[PDB]
Amino acid sequence: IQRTPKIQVYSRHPAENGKSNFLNCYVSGFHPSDIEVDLLKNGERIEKVEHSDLSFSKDWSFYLLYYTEFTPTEKDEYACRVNHVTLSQPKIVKWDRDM
Amino acid sequence: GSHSMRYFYTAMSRPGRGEPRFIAVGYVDDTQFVRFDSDAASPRMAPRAPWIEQEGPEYWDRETQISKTNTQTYRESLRNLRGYYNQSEAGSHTLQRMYGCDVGPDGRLLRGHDQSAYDGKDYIALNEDLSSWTAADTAAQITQRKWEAAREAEQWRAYLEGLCVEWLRRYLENGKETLQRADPPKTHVTHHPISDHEATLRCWALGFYPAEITLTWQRDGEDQTQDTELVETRPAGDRTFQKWAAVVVPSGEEQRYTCHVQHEGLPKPLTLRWEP
Amino acid sequence: VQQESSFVM
């Protein structure tokens, strides 16, 4: 069976313009396990992004956390771009401070 | 104050791209503590929590050998299951297993678990009696017959009542400063006008451990289940978790709404209101 | 600690 990823984009700590933080993209609820996840800074791929080791929930669906150190400002936009076999085209979810 | 140990094994075939990748991770509650990945440049069971690093070389050798043997056996299982379902050699398939034990505040076995899934569907599970199997279909019946013959259930019972409980108790003691520390959520309510007529109240819980939490909105003391947008609990990346619950409320009715938070780290369950 | 490598499916 194939299950489409849920995606949440958010920071490790509440965002303070100019203070070092972590940008997270948590992808979950997906199956099978192969997935393409990028963090974007103003539409462009950020490079040195890490992720958790592959695990899965009680319903067998996989989850991963992708994260990078970042410093929020009013200027820069951030997003997460996800591709999975279930998605016709990659999915882009913008980082909203309030979510 | 009950606790769980679980291992999660994922083997995935990738015809044309080498042999099936085998990954194993081990958790106590929501804390990952070991991992193995057959794709690693030099595969070995590796620590992922400070409190397991004190285990000696004989520990690491045992866990690595098991993982290497598993990498081989899972590839054999995947070929077998491909046959059981009359599937082509061209498709990718996944086999997953999750097993382990739950212990009560006194450290006694509450129950053991062992379940497997093929391509995301339940395949075969050890029953709560630790002595019989539940097979999802006629393919899993072939596995069940093999395992019955090999006296697998008896092996699982011995492990689950024995080493699983014993080592979970050791890990809980070695990592007591974190594994046995519940961090309560830092909570707040934010208000976001949607329109002249409505606003969103969002109840936040941050920095909590373990992940288990309950966040609810009430209006005039009635739970707002159907109307609450609840996001999946999510990791912060520093061991802790985050969650929020949102409701859309008519303008000027905000004070009829209360956010309720339950978490084991909290001296008392919280009632929160928007404080303008 | 892990269960000993289990029997093939």
Measured between CB atoms, which of A10, A53, A98 is closest to B25?
A53
In Å, how far are A52, A60, B124 from A46, measured between CA atoms?
A: 17, 30, 42
Nearest CA in chain C to B159: C3
DSSP C7: P
Please count the other Cβ atoms lying within 10 Å of the Cβ belonging to residue B37: 20
Vertex B190 angle, CA B247 and A67, to 5°? 95
Same domain, B203 and B148: no
A34 touches chain B (CB under 8 A): yes
Q: State the smallest CA–CA distance between residue A70 and chain B in angstroms.
A: 13
- Cα dihedral A32, A33, A39, A43, rounded to 10, equals -30
Closest-CA distance of chain C to residue B210, Å: 21
Gap between the Cα atoms of B45 and B25, Å rounded: 9
**Amino acid in the structure at residue B169:** R
For chain A, give the longest Cα–Cα distance.
44
Same domain, B24 and B128: yes
Documented resolution in Å:
1.9
Is A2 an 8 Å CB contact of chain B? yes
Which amino acid, B33? F
Domain with A63, as residue range(s), is 1-99
The distance of Cα B229 from the centroid of its chain, to the nearest Å, equals 23
Residue at a domain's end among B155, B181, B207:
B181
Provide the 8-state DSSP code for C3: P
- CA pair distance B208, B265, nearest whole angstrom: 8
Q: Which of B158, B181, B204 is the last residue in one of the domains?
A: B181
The DSSP bridge partners found for residue B209 are: B183
Residue C1 is classified by DSSP as -
Number of domains composing chain A = 1
Residues of C with CB under 8 A from a CB of B: 1-9
Q: How far apart are CA B217 and CA B230, in angstroms?
A: 10
Contacts of A15 (CB under 8 A, 6+ apart): A21, A72, A97
Q: Which residues of chain B have a CB within 8 Å of the CB of C6?
A: 73, 152, 155
Report the C-alpha dihedral over residues B165, B168, B173, B179, rounded to 10 degrees: -140
Please spell the DSSP secondary structure of chain A, one letter per residue: --BPPEEEEEESS---TTS-EEEEEEEEEEBSS--EEEEEETTEE-S--EEPPPEE-TTS-EEEEEEEEE---SS--EEEEEE-TT-SS-EEEE--TT-
Whichever domain contains B42, its CATH number is: 3.30.500.10
| Domain housing B105 | 1-181
Number of domains chain B contains:
2
B221: left (phi over 0), alpha (psi -120 to 50) or beta: left
Q: Please calculate the CA angle B56-B11-B30 and round it to the nearest 5 degrees.
A: 55
